[PDB]
Amino acid sequence: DIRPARISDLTGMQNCNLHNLPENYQLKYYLYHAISWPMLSYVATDPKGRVVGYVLAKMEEEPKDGIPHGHITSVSVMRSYRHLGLAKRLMVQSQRAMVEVYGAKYMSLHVRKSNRAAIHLYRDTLQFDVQGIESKYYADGEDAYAMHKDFS
Ligand SMILES: CC(=O)SCCNC(=O)CCNC(=O)[C@H](O)C(C)(C)COP(=O)(O)OP(=O)(O)OC[C@H]1O[C@@H](n2cnc3c(N)ncnc32)[C@H](O)[C@@H]1OP(=O)(O)O
């Protein structure tokens, strides 16, 4: 059901976002970056091989002081498969690989201010802190919450 993401998963991934299309805006870019950090990014696949959820991530390329840290760049579970703990499961596997493989000291992400489900997922169940608002972060103008999880 869960396996590393591949370049050929792009179409399946796009199809997870049929009812929240802004998640496709940067998907290809983030997928290319994901692939260049093996073991960080995962797809969840139904009995027919169909992608029904995914997590994309990357390590910072030129970290300050050489201190490794990670970014979750996109996570999505199609509506049919939501509320099953799939996103939780994907995020945890990505987290564990960041720490165990690349020695991440922490991880960061951005989320739209209006994305109540994702904020709850990050803040309540995965215990991220909120650093603050990054004004006009998205191409369409919306602010992002900048969020962080320390692996200390
Ligand atoms: C860094 C970025 O990628 S930001 C963009 C985030 N991704 C998107 O918004 C894509 C569109 N949305 C999605 O695909 C989904 O709604 C996701 C990925 C946010 C959540 O996927 P799910 O599989 O439903 O979440 P999952 O079942 O693993 O976890 C549930 C938890 O997330 C939270 N949550 C999920 N949906 C909701 C909801 N509709 N409203 C409130 N909290 C919610 C809760 O805190 C919850 O724990 P609980 O079951 O004890 O209440």
Q: Would you list the DSSP string of 25-53?
A: TTHHHHHHHHHTSTTS-EEEE-TTS-EEE
Q: Which strand (E) or helix (H) includes residue 102?
A: helix 86-102
Residue for token digits 């989320």?
111
Q: In what order do the strands lie in the sheet with 70-77?
A: 2-4, 42-45, 51-59, 70-77, 106-112, 144-150, 129-134
Q: Looking at ligand 1, which residue's alpha carbon is closest to its atom 20? A: 87
* Dist. CA 87–CA 23, nearest whole Å: 15
Ligand 1: centre distance to CA 44 (Å) = 15
Contact 37, 61 (CB under 8 A): no
Phi, psi torsion values for 9, nearest 5 degrees: -85, -5
Would you mind telling me the total number of residues written for the chain in this entry? 152
CA 123 to chain centre: 14
Q: Looking at ligand 1, which residue's alpha carbon is closest to its atom 41? A: 117
Domains along the sequence of the chain with CATH: 1-152 (3.40.630.30)
Experimental structure resolution, Å: 2.0
Nearest C-alpha neighbor of 146 from the set 128, 125, 121: 128
Ligand 1: centre distance to CA 54 (Å) = 12
| Cα separations in angstroms, 100 against 3, 26, 33, 68 | 17, 27, 19, 12
Q: Ligand 1 site: residues with CB under 6 angstroms?
A: 20, 23, 72, 74-77, 82-88, 109, 111, 115-118, 120-121, 124-125
How many CA atoms are closer than 13 Å to the CA of 87, on its beta-carbon side? 20
Q: Looking at ligand 1, which residue's alpha carbon is closest to its atom 26? A: 85
- Enter the tokens of residue 21: 């299309």
- 3-state class of 143 per DSSP? coil
- Other beta carbons less than 10 A from residue 24's beta carbon: 17
Q: Looking at ligand 1, which residue's alpha carbon is closest to its atom 22? A: 82
Q: Which strand (E) or helix (H) includes residue 97?
A: helix 86-102
Contact 57, 70 (CB under 8 A): yes
Ligand 1: centre distance to CA 62 (Å) = 30
- 3-state class of 107 per DSSP? strand
